Amino acid sequence: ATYKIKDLTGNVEFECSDDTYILDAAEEAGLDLPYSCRAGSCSSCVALLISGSVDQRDASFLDEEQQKYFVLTCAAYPNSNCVIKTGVEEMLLGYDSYRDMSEYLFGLLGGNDSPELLDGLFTPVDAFRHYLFGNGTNKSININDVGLSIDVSQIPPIMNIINQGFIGRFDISSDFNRNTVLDGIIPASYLGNITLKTEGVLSISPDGAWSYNGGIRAYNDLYDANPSTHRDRLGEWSTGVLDKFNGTPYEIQIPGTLDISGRGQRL
Amino acid sequence: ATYKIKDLTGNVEFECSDDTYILDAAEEAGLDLPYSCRAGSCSSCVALLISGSVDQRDASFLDEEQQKYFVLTCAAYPNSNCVIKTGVEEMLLGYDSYRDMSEYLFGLLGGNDSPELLDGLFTPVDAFRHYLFGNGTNKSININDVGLSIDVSQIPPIMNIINQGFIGRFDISSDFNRNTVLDGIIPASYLGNITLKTEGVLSISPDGAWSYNGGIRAYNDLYDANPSTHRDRLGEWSTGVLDKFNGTPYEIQIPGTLDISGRGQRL
Amino acid sequence: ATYKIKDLTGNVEFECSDDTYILDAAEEAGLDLPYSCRAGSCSSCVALLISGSVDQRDASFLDEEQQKYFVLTCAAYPNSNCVIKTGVEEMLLGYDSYRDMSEYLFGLLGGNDSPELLDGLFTPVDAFRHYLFGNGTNKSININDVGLSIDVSQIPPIMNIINQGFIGRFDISSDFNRNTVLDGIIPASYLGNITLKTEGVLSISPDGAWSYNGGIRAYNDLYDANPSTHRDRLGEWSTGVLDKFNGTPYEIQIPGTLDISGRGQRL
Amino acid sequence: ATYKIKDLTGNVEFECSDDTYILDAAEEAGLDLPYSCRAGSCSSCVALLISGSVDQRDASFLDEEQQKYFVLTCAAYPNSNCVIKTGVEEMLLGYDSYRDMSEYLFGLLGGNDSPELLDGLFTPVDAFRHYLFGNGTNKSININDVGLSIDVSQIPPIMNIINQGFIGRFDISSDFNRNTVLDGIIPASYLGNITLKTEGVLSISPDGAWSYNGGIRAYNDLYDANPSTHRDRLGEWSTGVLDKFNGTPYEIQIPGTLDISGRGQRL
Ligand SMILES: O=S([O-])[O-]
Ligand SMILES: O=S([O-])[O-]
Ligand code: FES
Ligand code: FES
Ligand code: FES
Ligand code: FES
Ligand SMILES: [Cl-]
Ligand SMILES: [Cl-]
Ligand SMILES: [Mg+2]
Ligand SMILES: [Mg+2]
Ligand SMILES: [Mg+2]
Ligand SMILES: [Mg+2]
Ligand code: NA
Ligand code: NA
Ligand code: NA
Ligand code: NA
Ligand code: NA
Ligand code: NA
Ligand code: NA
Ligand code: NA
């Protein structure tokens, strides 16, 4: 019947019955896959065939060997659920053996895992491992799982209003920097400084009593610390590793909203 | 509510309700976990809280930020599935920060991965990565998913019978070695030589016509290749990785039965 | 060893070592369970043994069959963690079988569940089901989750001051009625009219500019509507239900504080 | 991280990630839901937000007031586990009050309880209440918590071998029926007859001494007794409750393995 296709390029999954070409099913789901011709006679749509059976008798550009490892998405019907990696044109031309592509494949594992970072004590070293071997695919951790303890008095753009003596009702919509050292050793060992945004209402009475009610969201944070920072957060064993292995920066998505409330009395 | 508790100390999983102290449940399952005071007031039962949430109000002494990274198995109620590492009294007694334990945690990162190996082009590199990060924990792959293509003619303890000229009905129960180079590049790139066992009935008629009906099962395969073998299977990149990061041997369980039938004519 | 005892009367928990009678351990932690003889010689201290194991060889009043379901707290040592329901002296005095205490035990389930009301569109019917089967135990919902949208113009004790032409600074501390129809159909469908309290400061300048800044808390609300009101709120089916099944009133606790502020100009 | 979305239209329950729209996550699960646009524009996606919180900022159609009760599922992220009902669109007319849905929602209130049955004296009445309000969702209790006391003499497929006079070593793999009246009043009051399976080795020496070693597992049990059985197990009160509120059969999962040993002498 219908089989699921996972494209490791961007970690997207789309349905495809056994009478639809893989490329058309992808476009049907709004996906912009590569193609030049559309008749099984070039390599513009070539994808790695990581796992699954495909019927590509319509394919003519790949021979018998390449068909064991690659698939023309415009000319192939699925026979099972499939994993593919689109956009690997340079690979097909230079392909020699499994051996010669195994390092590239080992590098795809990080992106094929769940994007969600491991929790607890694993989160910072999971982040560092993905830096070493993940080749830039995004990871994620909900803002509610990061372990932040944000007090209103730690939010400069709100305290900026309070401390200038203003009185009244203020619609807050501000970015601010959060040094997660204030929050705990776990977030401080892979996130460091992060950019947050708060939206809400600050009320300040004639006599300086204030309240704030709103939410906090987080921008994606770029994991690209230098070795000196890795040494501060993880220790000099990280420096010995980075002396031999280069990291690849990637984004940590931090979805969700953190509710925030606070009250105080000025001066 | 019961939850899953893995102790990467010996990689054992046991059941524990939200009313059971983790030390008691593990003692139920006959496990030998460290303890001394059994009263929430010493460092002998302390495990790392690598993942999960717990109820440690009877713990008392932790109290500090310590409670987010340590758990007292004699006085803790599981509020979730938990990865824990017993035997860390030394880290509790003298950790300054995450810096001191990050390298230990890093090497343990695959210790709670699912056992099933990835399929297809991923299987050999998945097996290699688990060698580096798996903490010696089991992987598995069904014998029907390995990609084995065995003819009876490649089974010596059966062919040894046919070629001696015997005539009759043989109950076969024989181990034999299988070099999966014969089966394909994928199994050859992480299994190499495996030991199989076949059980069945071999019939040889007076005129030399023969047939065999049976099954094939596989013993657990130790993944422990030396650097030369990895260099052959994967290439020279594997050597730099293995030098810096250490491999821990683990077993690949190959459950299931593979059916086999064959027939021929001796002369 | 030392164990935990949970008395379903109030859902109170306390410790009890294996060499302390349940009753004594309860008093040593501030509780006040019934007793008279304190010598295993009546039913003043009897409790249902929901679960757990006790040594009550000192318990004369209970025969072996009764000791499967009941425990004399002055005569029993905990062998394990225990859930009990004290004060059930009559239950025993009429006991004959599990069958004959099952309706009573069913009526304890509502009190045993979490006291927080379900959310959203389940809140009004969760409240009605607890009315039917909860036998009077408290429920709760945080004032912030009720769905109140209160404007100072809806608070008569504040508006009465402004509307009389007064000028100055008023310390406010007043109860007032909140018809939660003003707030939304969910609160209107189980809370109806509730009593709130506000404390804060009303300042009215000579030119009639005014502002109010304070907080709002909620008294416990007694859920005790008559069938006419249930029919208004839930529909005719509730009258069919109430024609065969009686409710028991219970209090809904509404903890927390809401921030309130308002501004206006009298002319 | 990832939340359970439960849709009342099919009693279906499917995961949805914090960064994924509810409709997309439903499409990936195997579900078919209504969709006309996908920019928050129409109402074909609209669902009733029964329980939980969503982020609907991308959505444009619904007013701030309708967002309290309605969710555009192609444009909404879950903030929490959610209960919705898809296949709604007419209700936006404003011709359905809370009164019109209240009886429906009341009847499935137990449908999101955790699956583990309560222990001890509560188990039978917990099972009965789930029959009334659980909407057919599963419950569970570990076989080791049920209170079974099975002796090998009560296992007919083992005694059958012993009693025919056989001598040797036998692999046992046999279903058999257990009337839990044999085990205790609690299991007899909600499980009744259950089907179990035992796997193990029975050895019988020439002199008729026998030993059995193995384990026992339980099949899922359907809770669907008729009003007569409920009266016998709980009493007359259960019939009036059952008449008014009605039962929905559901399965009780009984996981785990119960170890069993027997020793005897055939003589
Ligand atoms: O600005 S927020 O959506 O990250
Ligand atoms: O843990 S690393 O330094 O091999
Ligand atoms: S686009 Fe040319 S082969 Fe598919
Ligand atoms: S054994 Fe001492 S704290 Fe647990
Ligand atoms: S007080 Fe009399 S039996 Fe306990
Ligand atoms: S399909 Fe139109 S808003 Fe969802
Ligand atoms: Cl995969
Ligand atoms: Cl309060
Ligand atoms: Mg950062
Ligand atoms: Mg091998
Ligand atoms: Mg009221
Ligand atoms: Mg049954
Ligand atoms: Na959000
Ligand atoms: Na929050
Ligand atoms: Na439990
Ligand atoms: Na080396
Ligand atoms: Na106002
Ligand atoms: Na329950
Ligand atoms: Na058998
Ligand atoms: Na009903």
Residue numbers in the entry:
A (entry chain C), B (entry chain B), C (entry chain D), D (entry chain A): 2 to 268
Could you give the paper's own sentences about this structure?
Pectocin M1 (PM1), the bacteriocin from phytopathogenic Pectobacterium carotovorum which causes soft rot disease, has a unique ferredoxin domain that allows it to use FusA of the plant ferredoxin uptake system.
